[PDB]
């Protein structure tokens, strides 16, 4: 990869509250690109929801 590694490490250069906000942002199905979680982990939250 190249300079866009900053986009991928943007999570680790953000406050922990903001990190977990990005991880849980996969509800509306229009935000499945910024969220880096695997689909199996996403399913567990949706099952509980």
């Amino acid at each position: 990869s190249a300079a866009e590694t900053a986009r991928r490490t943007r999570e680790f250069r953000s406050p922990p509250q903001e990190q977990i906000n990005m991880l849980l942002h996969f509800k509306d199905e229009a935000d499945e690109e910024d969220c880096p979680l695997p689909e199996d982990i996403r399913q567990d939250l949706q099952d509980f929801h």
Partner: protein, 145 residues
């Protein structure tokens, strides 16, 4: 030199000088050129045949290109583009330093991470949830049993 400031190649300036050979100064109209021309013509190797239209444009083009690029170096004129600007650093330098030392989520204690999860979950999943019950509730309460 003005044509070089307009990003012209060596051919463009030469043809520009070819059509503008009549704009060279006249000795009678300037007092400075009176003594300069007399001093210039006193050199041993100065022949009047050397003032050909082609010979004039060649030397002027060569010197002008050197003169133009020389003042680009001594006077870079790159100022007023990025002056000392203090975009936000003088007050936000602590933030950018703090960004590179921000604690990753996996290093937090479990109880702290759970509290952050609850705040994130309610704002993004519970608040965003849509449940319309007002119409159903009013309809139920408006019925005589």
């Amino acid at each position: 030199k003005t044509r070089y400031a307009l990003k012209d190649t060596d051919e463009e300036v030469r043809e520009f000088l070819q059509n503008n050979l009549h704009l060279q100064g006249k000795v009678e109209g300037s007092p400075s050129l009176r003594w300069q021309m007399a001093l210039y013509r006193g050199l041993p190797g100065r022949e009047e045949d050397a003032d050909d239209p082609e010979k004039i444009v060649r030397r002027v083009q060569e010197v002008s290109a050197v003169l133009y690029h020389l003042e680009q170096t001594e006077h870079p004129y790159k100022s007023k583009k990025a002056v000392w600007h203090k975009l936000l650093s003088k007050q936000r330098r602590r933030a950018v330093v703090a960004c590179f030392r921000m604690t990753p989520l996996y290093n937090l204690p479990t109880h702290r991470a759970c509290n952050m999860f609850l705040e994130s979950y309610k704002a993004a999943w519970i608040l965003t949830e849509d449940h319309s019950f007002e119409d159903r509730m009013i309809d139920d309460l408006s019925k005589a049993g």
